[PDB]
C-alpha cells in the first residue's frame, strides 16, 4: 500500500526528537540540537524558528527541507497578511498555508514530499494559545501535547501521563526538559538543547518604546544561560 509519503513519514520517524506542550497561560516548543562535528559552531544553525512575533515552529526530519519551508512560511506570513490585512495571522491561518506548501510538493510529479513534520505553536486574540502538528502529507492536527521523531512513542507516553488542563507555562517547561532529557542522543546542557515559548508579551523585545499600541513578541527563544539555570533544578 505504501507510497512516497509513507517514506517521507519514515524520514520524520528517523529524525531528531522535538515536542510541544500547551499550558493554561502559554506554549512550549523544544528539541535537541545535534552536532555533525565538535569543530561545528552549533549557534550558527537554528532548530527553533520565529514565523511571526506570536507564532513559532520546531521540526523533525530533514533539516534543509525545514529551512526552505520556514523561509517560505515567513514569506507566506508576509505577502498574505502583513501586506494586505496590515496584521499577522492567527496560528490556524499560517498552519493552513504551511500545509498548502507541503501538499503542493506531494502533488506535483517530479517533486518529492518535504521530509519534515512540524510543530507550530502560537497565540491569537480569538483562539488563544494553540499547538498544531503538520505532516509531510500537507495535513494538520491540533494537539494538547505531542512529540515527533525517534523518541516520540516514549515521549507521547510521558506526555499522556503528565498533561492536565491546569499546567502553568513554567511547569510545562519542566515537563518539556524532562521529556527531552530521556531521549537525548548527545550531551544534555543549554548548548545541546533548543527551547522556546509563546507566553506573555515581552515589551523589551519590541526593541523600541513610545507607541502604546505595539506590545512586542509573545514568542521567545530561551538563552542557553536561562536553560542552564533551569537545568540546575531539573
Amino acid at each position: 500500500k505504501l507510497g512516497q509519503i509513507d517514506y517521507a513519514l519514515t524520514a520524520v520517524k528517523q529524525g531528531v526528537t522535538s515536542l510541544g506542550i500547551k499550558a493554561t497561560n502559554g506554549v512550549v516548543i523544544a528539541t535537541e540540537k545535534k552536532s555533525s562535528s565538535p569543530l561545528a559552531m552549533s549557534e550558527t544553525l537554528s532548530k527553533v524558528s520565529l514565523l511571526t512575533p506570536d507564532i513559532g515552529a520546531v521540526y523533525s526530519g530533514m533539516g534543509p527541507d525545514y529551512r526552505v519551508l520556514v523561509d517560505k512560511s515567513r514569506k507566506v506570513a508576509h505577502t498574505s497578511y502583513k501586506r494586505i490585512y496590515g496584521e499577522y495571522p492567527p496560528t490556524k491561518l499560517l498552519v493552513s498555508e504551511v500545509a498548502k506548501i507541503m501538499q503542493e510538493a506531494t502533488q506535483s510529479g517530479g517533486v518529492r514530499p518535504f521530509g519534515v513534520s512540524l510543530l507550530i505553536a502560537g497565540h491569537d486574540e480569538f483562539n488563544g494559545f494553540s499547538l498544531y502538528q503538520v505532516d509531510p502529507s500537507g495535513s494538520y492536527f491540533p494537539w494538547k501535547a505531542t512529540a515527533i521523531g525517534k523518541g516520540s512513542v516514549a515521549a507521547k507516553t510521558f506526555l499522556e501521563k503528565r498533561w492536565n488542563d491546569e499546567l502553568e507555562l513554567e511547569d510545562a517547561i519542566h515537563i518539556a526538559l524532562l521529556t527531552l532529557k530521556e531521549s537525548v542522543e548527545g550531551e544534555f546542557n543549554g548548548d545541546t538543547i533548543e527551547l522556546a515559548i509563546i507566553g506573555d508579551e515581552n515589551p523589551d523585545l519590541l526593541g523600541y518604546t513610545g507607541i502604546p499600541t505595539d506590545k512586542g513578541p509573545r514568542f521567545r527563544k530561551l538563552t542557553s544561560q536561562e536553560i542552564n539555570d533551569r537545568l540546575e533544578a531539573l
Binding site: 499547538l131 492536527f141 491540533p142 494537539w143 494538547k144 501535547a145 507521547k156 506526555l159 499522556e160 498533561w163
Partner: protein, 225 residues
C-alpha cells in the same frame, strides 16, 4: 467508478437525521480519539450553513470544511442578493452539483464526504436530505450515514411515524444511537446534537446546536442514565 469513495465514508462515525411534523433533529457521534488530540476546535460533525439550515457529516473534515465554507459563502451571497434566505433544495442541489463535477472530471478527486442537510423554508416546509460522493441526493423522513447505517435504518424504519412531534424525534435519535452504539454506553462528550423548530412561539426558524449541558439534560430526560 466512485464506489471506493462511498466505501471511505462507511468507517467515519455516525449521523442520524429525523424529521417531525413540526421540526427536524440532527444527532451525530464523534469517534473516540487520542487523549492529547485537541477536541475544542472547528472540525466537528454538526456544522451550520445559515440560521435555517444545519449539516451533520460523515467522511473527512478536510473535504467537509471546503464544502461547508462554499455553502456559507453561497448562502450569504443569496441572502445578500434577494433579502430572503436560500431554499434548502437550492443549497443541496448547489452542493450536489459541485460534488458531481469533482467526481466526473479526472483532473480532480471525488470528495470523500456525505452531509445530512436539515433545514426549513416556506416553499416546501422542513426538508431533510442526504448527499454522497457520487453527487446524487435524496429527500427523507429519516436517514443516517456512516458507521452502523444498516442497523440504524432498520430501527428508524420500525419506530418512525409520519405524525411524530420534534420531541419524539429527539427520543428516536437518542434511542437509535443508544441501540446502535459502538461503545457499550452513550455519553454527552461523544454526542453532537441539533434541532430546527418553529420559533419560541412566533413564526421564526429557531436553530439550536446544543451545548454539552443541554445534551446531558436530554439524555437524563430520555433514560440514557
Amino acid at each position: 467508478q466512485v464506489e471506493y469513495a462511498l466505501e471511505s465514508i462507511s468507517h467515519a462515525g455516525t449521523a442520524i437525521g429525523i424529521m417531525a411534523s413540526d421540526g427536524i433533529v440532527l444527532a451525530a457521534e464523534r469517534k473516540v480519539t487520542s487523549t492529547l488530540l485537541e477536541q475544542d476546535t472547528s472540525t466537528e460533525k454538526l456544522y451550520k450553513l445559515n440560521d435555517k439550515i444545519a449539516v451533520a457529516v460523515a467522511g473527512l473534515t478536510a473535504d467537509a470544511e471546503i464544502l461547508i465554507n462554499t455553502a456559507r459563502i453561497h448562502a450569504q451571497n443569496y441572502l445578500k442578493t434577494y433579502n430572503e434566505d436560500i431554499p434548502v433544495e437550492i443549497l443541496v442541489r448547489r452542493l450536489s452539483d459541485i460534488k458531481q463535477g469533482y467526481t466526473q472530471h479526472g483532473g480532480l478527486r471525488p470528495f470523500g464526504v456525505s452531509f445530512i442537510y436539515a433545514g426549513y423554508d416556506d416553499r416546501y416546509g422542513y426538508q431533510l436530505y442526504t448527499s454522497n460522493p457520487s453527487g446524487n441526493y435524496t429527500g427523507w423522513k429519516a436517514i443516517s450515514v456512516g458507521a452502523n447505517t444498516s442497523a440504524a435504518q432498520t430501527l428508524l424504519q420500525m419506530d418512525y411515524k409520519d405524525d411524530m412531534k420534534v420531541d419524539d424525534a429527539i427520543e428516536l435519535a437518542l434511542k437509535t444511537l443508544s441501540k446502535t452504539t459502538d461503545s457499550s454506553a452513550l455519553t454527552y462528550d461523544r454526542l453532537e446534537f441539533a434541532t430546527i423548530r418553529k420559533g419560541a412561539n412566533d413564526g421564526e426558524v429557531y436553530q439550536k446546536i446544543f451545548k454539552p449541558q443541554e445534551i446531558k439534560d436530554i439524555l437524563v430526560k430520555t433514560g440514557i442514565t
